[PDB]
Amino acid sequence: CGLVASNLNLKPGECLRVRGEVAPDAKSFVLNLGKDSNNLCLHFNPRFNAHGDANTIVCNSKDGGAWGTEQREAVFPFQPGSVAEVCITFDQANLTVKLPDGYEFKFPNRLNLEAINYMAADGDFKIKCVAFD
């Protein structure tokens, strides 16, 4: 398991910036955002070749320990053995994950928490930098 950060107190409109290294043999990695490990308003899971999925981004939520219904994206701007930066924010309606190159994914805000207090990295993704705005 990778880096875990709590007491983030990231409120709506504020931007959470993460830069990390994607392993050369990356099969998938995970960014979890929410209140804690049982309450995630964003489970961001790019799958290069995992659980039957190939180059597919799987997002989901976790509410009181229970997974919600997962949502999948066709575009997959991630590359094994490379540096990836994501900027993440949210409002009452959506969480937004922006890449530098202009890619933008949205996932519906299902938990409607006041803030993001929890971030966890997992899988083949070595976090090098975290910033708050």
Ligand X SMILES: CO[C@@H]1O[C@H](CO)[C@@H](O)[C@H](O[C@@H]2O[C@H](CO)[C@H](O)[C@H](O)[C@H]2O)[C@H]1NC(C)=O
Count of residues of this chain found to bind ligand X when the rule CB under 6 A is applied: 7
From the list a copy of itself, ligand X, none, which binds 25 (C-beta under 5 to 8 Å, kind-based)? none
Q: How far is the CB of 127 from a copy of itself (least distance, A)?
A: 7
CB of 9 to a copy of itself, least distance (A): 8
By CB under 8 A, tell whether 1 contacts a copy of itself.
yes
On whether 104 is known to bind a ligand per the annotation, the reply is no
Of 60, 86, 88, 116, which lies in the binding site for ligand X, with binding defined by CB under 6 A?
A: 60
Report the alpha-carbon distance of residue 68 to residue 110 in Å, rounded: 9
Q: How many alpha carbons fall within 13 Å on the CB side of residue 46?
A: 21
Name residues contacting ligand X, limited to 62-81 (CB under 6 A): 67, 70
Q: Answer yes or no: is 109 a known binding residue.
A: no
8 A C-beta contact, residue 50 and residue 28: yes
Token pair for 26: 């990356």
- Minimal distance, residue 8 CB to a copy of itself, in Å: 7
Q: Which of 22, 33, 45, 86 binds ligand X (CB under 6 A)?
A: 45
Sequence-distant (6+) residues with CB within 8 A of 119 are 3, 4, 5, 6, 8, 16, 18, 31, 32, 33, 130
Does 4 sit near a copy of itself (CB under 8 A)? yes
**Token pair listed for 72:** 């999948």
* Residue closest to 22 by CA, chosen among 88, 91, 82: 82
Judged by the rule CB under 8 A, the positions of this chain that interact with a copy of itself are 1-8, 17, 127-133
